[PDB]
Write an enzyme that holds these catalytic residues in place. Structure first.
Site, PDB file in Angstrom:
ATOM      1  N   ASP A  85       0.829  -1.198   0.000  1.00  0.00           N
ATOM      2  CA  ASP A  85       0.000   0.000   0.000  1.00  0.00           C
ATOM      3  C   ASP A  85       0.864   1.248   0.000  1.00  0.00           C
ATOM      4  O   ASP A  85       1.342   1.675   1.045  1.00  0.00           O
ATOM      5  CB  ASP A  85      -0.909  -0.015   1.237  1.00  0.00           C
ATOM      6  CG  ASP A  85      -1.808   1.185   1.319  1.00  0.00           C
ATOM      7  OD1 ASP A  85      -1.925   1.895   0.303  1.00  0.00           O
ATOM      8  OD2 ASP A  85      -2.411   1.391   2.400  1.00  0.00           O
TER       9      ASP A  85
ATOM     10  N   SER B  46      -0.676  15.535 -12.092  1.00  0.00           N
ATOM     11  CA  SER B  46      -0.922  15.178 -13.475  1.00  0.00           C
ATOM     12  C   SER B  46      -1.167  16.431 -14.308  1.00  0.00           C
ATOM     13  O   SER B  46      -1.703  17.419 -13.819  1.00  0.00           O
ATOM     14  CB  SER B  46      -2.123  14.226 -13.555  1.00  0.00           C
ATOM     15  OG  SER B  46      -2.512  13.966 -14.893  1.00  0.00           O
TER      16      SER B  46
END
EC number: 3.4.23.22
Length: 330
Positions: free
Chosen positions: A35, A199
């Protein structure tokens, strides 16, 4: 040193991935959920409330000659989906794919929430976010990666998740045969303890690319792709019959649909998520309503590039002094 381990979907939907991890002496192998959005290595154990164990493999520290109680230490964590676990702490030897760390904090669960109990395939979590998020008190502990880092050939790990197939976590090296083209690297903020990046935009299907900054986290421990409501609405508008269902808890679409791809930007580069990756199947057995793999982050407080996005790429988690993230197509 290096390590290399195969990671395997837990089910036919790629709801999560499990990776075998050796703990203790002699080794006890548990299948952990790696994770990159948390920083605790915790396991089902001989200390876990018996009614809360249902098929998981447990760690038994009393059977490990290298286990030592970390006196006074406790831990307690909650995740974004409302699940949680807590307990006490041992140090022991932990190996992943041939890479060994001695003195790793292994957090033994005394309590786990129902969602963990109900998932028989996941024996615990191995956190790979920054150690500043580790929940052990009163002495915070380091992640497996931080402990290993100085010994690694290069201070990196890579995630290569499969679509409906196994994939690989590598530590200490970049497998140049595992991706196509070049890896594009992008800046990371560690201010919130995550692999947080920005992004450069998105496209839906064969549509034009929208240049827009989207700040989010690379999180292998989250199944879906959670993005701003504007972006998600633009995606689902291209699927006939798709709608947001408050009763189901997100966007659903007719199972008869063919889903468009979704592209996200990494600097000037582009990663394309095929439409099929966005299908999470019937909302309930036999239903013709299917659950979408791109959902709004509006109720979460952060955008999350979860498995839906990451499994479309070869992803480098660069833990150099100034961390960065790399993405390549594959």
């Amino acid at each position: 040193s290096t390590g290399s381990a195969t990671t395997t979907p837990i089910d036919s939907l790629d709801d999560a991935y499990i990776t075998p991890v050796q703990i203790g002496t002699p080794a006890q192998t548990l299948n952990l959920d790696f994770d990159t959005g948390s920083s605790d290595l915790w396991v089902f154990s001989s200390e876990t409330t018996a009614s809360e164990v249902d098929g998981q493999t447990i760690y038994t520290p009393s059977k490990s000659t290298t286990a030592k109680l970390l006196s006074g230490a406790t831990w307690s964590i909650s995740y974004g989906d409302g699940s949680s676990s807590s307990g006490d702490v041992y140090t022991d030897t932990v190996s992943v794919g041939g890479l060994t760390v001695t003195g790793q904090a292994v957090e033994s669960a005394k309590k786990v929430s129902s969602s963990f109990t109900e998932d028989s395939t996941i024996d615990g979590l191995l956190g790979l976010a920054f150690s500043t998020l580790n929940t052990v008190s009163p002495t915070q502990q380091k992640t497996f990666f931080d402990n290993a880092k100085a010994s690694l050939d290069s201070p990196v790990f890579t995630a290569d998740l499969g679509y409906h197939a196994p994939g690989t976590y590598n530590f200490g090296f970049i497998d140049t045969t595992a991706y196509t083209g070049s890896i594009t690297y992008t800046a990371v903020s560690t201010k919130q303890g995550f692999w947080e990046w920005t992004s450069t935009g998105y496209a839906v299907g064969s549509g034009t690319f929208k240049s827009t900054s989207i700040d989010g986290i690379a999180d292998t421990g989250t199944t879906l792709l959670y993005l701003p409501a504007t972006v998600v609405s633009a995606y689902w508008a291209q699927v006939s019959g798709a709608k947001s269902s408050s009763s189901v808890g997100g966007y659903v679409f007719p199972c008869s649909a063919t889903l468009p791809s979704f592209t996200f930007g990494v600097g000037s580069a582009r990663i394309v998520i095929p439409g099929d990756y966005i299908d999470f199947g019937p909302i309930s057995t036999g239903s013709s309503s299917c659950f979408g793999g791109i959902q709004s982050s509006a109720g979460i407080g952060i955008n999350i590039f979860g498995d839906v996005a990451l499994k479309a790429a070869f992803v480098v988690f660069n833990g150099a002094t100034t961390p960065t993230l790399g993405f390549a197509s594959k």
